[PDB]
């Protein structure tokens, strides 16, 4: 068994909390409670190896909000989440990635980008292509997920675990 | 001291004792400050609460270098404090110690006069 923390970052009002509950409970409820700081846990299996995941949903951040140092000490894995239905979320996730790297220099660290609210195809204002382009601009791994498509959330968290494993192997 | 100064007075008496102990170091080292250190001791004692249990410790710490006769009046106050604290026997002991003679064994004999202040206190 390997204990892994993950930190979920991004703009406010994007479904970081929704993704966390979807992955850890399989449900999705629209209350919109601004999450100051939340922690969830599971004991899952990836590639036949048991990972005890501890997910830390951070409060939404803006381009002016300072990056707390708590999520730079013992995180070993990051999920940068943005809403595909908000260009502001995309710009702010760019800013948040910049501030995170600044908090760790520019050291290589497992980071993966998530296009959230994919089901809202009508309201989409970020397509797949530019999200990818940003991801391999960061050398990160791209995915798209929604709080109504639990398979995608499981894919997201499995992917960040795999990225952490790959970075560890190097 | 996180609750009230009243509780912290027990430890503040210890602080007083330790600082006076450093002043005993200075008193032994520097003969020129002996009168000044004596006056500082007197004033600080006057500032303390008039409890025999603490005056005893403070004067006992002071006794390292200064005998009662060298600070007569100070001990007289202690005697007075013991006189009105349900410890009259200790007050008599202090006063006979300061006089050097015990009139309690010489009732017919008139009292000493070489030190009139202590005679008055006794």
């Amino acid at each position: 068994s390997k204990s892994r923390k993950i930190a979920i970052l991004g703009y406010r009002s994007v479904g970081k909390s929704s993704l966390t509950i979807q992955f850890v409970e399989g449900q999705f409820v629209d209350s919109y409670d601004p999450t100051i700081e939340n922690t969830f846990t599971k004991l899952i299996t990836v590639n036949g190896q048991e990972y005890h995941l501890q997910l830390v949903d951070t409060a939404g951040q803006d381009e002016y909000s300072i990056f707390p140092q708590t999520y730079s000490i013992d995180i070993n894995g990051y999920i940068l989440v943005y809403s595909v239905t908000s260009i502001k979320s995309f710009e702010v996730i760019k800013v948040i990635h910049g501030k995170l790297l600044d908090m760790v220099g520019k050291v290589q660290i497992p980071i993966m980008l998530v296009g959230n609210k994919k089901d809202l195809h009508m309201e989409r204002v970020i397509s797949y292509e530019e999200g990818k382009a940003l991801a391999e601009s960061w050398n990160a791994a791209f995915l798209e997920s929604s709080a109504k498509e639990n398979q995608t959330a499981v894919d997201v968290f499995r992917r960040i675990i795999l990225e952490a494993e790959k970075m560890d192997g190097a | 001291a996180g609750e009230s100064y009243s509780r912290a007075y027990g430890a503040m008496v210890s602080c007083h004792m330790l600082s006076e102990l450093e002043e005993v170091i200075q008193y032994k080292l520097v003969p020129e400050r002996r009168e000044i250190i004596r006056q500082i001791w007197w004033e600080r004692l006057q500032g303390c609460q008039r409890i025999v249990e603490d005056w005893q410790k403070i004067l006992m710490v002071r006794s390292l270098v200064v005998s009662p006769h060298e600070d007569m009046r100070t001990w007289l106050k202690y005697a007075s404090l013991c006189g009105k604290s349900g410890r009259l026997a200790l007050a008599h002991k202090t006063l006979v110690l300061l006089l050097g003679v015990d009139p309690s064994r010489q009732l017919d004999h008139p009292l000493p006069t070489v030190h009139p202040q202590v005679t008055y206190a006794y």
Binding site: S31, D33, P34, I36, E37, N38, T39, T41, A59, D62, Y64, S65, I66, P68, Q69, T70 | -
Partner: protein
Amino acid sequence: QAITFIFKSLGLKCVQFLPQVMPTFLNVIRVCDGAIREFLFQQLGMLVSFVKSHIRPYMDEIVTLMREFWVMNTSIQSTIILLIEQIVVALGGEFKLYLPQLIPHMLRVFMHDNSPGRIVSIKLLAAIQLFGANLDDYLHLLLPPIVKLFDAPEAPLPSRKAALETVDRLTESLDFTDYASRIIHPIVRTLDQSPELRSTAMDTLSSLVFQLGKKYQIFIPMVNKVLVRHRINHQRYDVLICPMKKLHVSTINLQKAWGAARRVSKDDWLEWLRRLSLELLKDSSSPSLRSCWALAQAYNPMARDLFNAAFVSCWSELNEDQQDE
């Protein structure tokens, strides 16, 4: 960052904490480091938006600080502009009284941007939609800058498009039947100058004509000639014929924080107390306390201060068995 997260959570109840927060808060904006004043202004805007109209007694000090820190720096300019946006949303009519104290600042911003940071004007212009009826007595001050922005060749195209959109949004909230109708003439030159931008120009013209009503219909022929030369049509032309709730106390980590099993030395016990006081805040059910956890972590005396309240918040959620443990 903590105070905001409290004011956001409580809602209008947060007004009860105004007289404590603001007099210090504004003062800190006056004496804080330059690197932090931008963040403090942004959080001031957020707090003002949450408070809505109950920010009147502090609005004079707020605008004073705004005036004496609205230097021509792009970052602070943008943050302050956001703060005016949020103040306009919060107050509206009352903010009229405080409008005249900011007009010279707006004008200097308009005529003193010399970089791609010219985008700041757009953000300032992005505030002008939200003004509406409170711009009546000062519309004629703010008009000639936008008049210049219509036909400015030096200004970037998106800035001019933004200016057209701004006057468009102003159209349905202000009485343009007065002298302001003269803005018809500027956009005409824009139609005959910039081809890529004609669409927003004609949308703006349609909205202005709709606001004006009969008073414009007399002067149609010049605009009709422009349209015929450009051959771009619109429907309106033909119409000219006529709280935050509680939070789940994570029980596992809560009794885990009370892990006095292998704590022996004095240093061990002090560390246990520190970790427990922090974990109580982290697992506190009330968002107000949990907002203080980040600050408590980097400042232990805060954790010591709220240990009792944090324990009360954590304890009231547990059931009989968890309480017994």
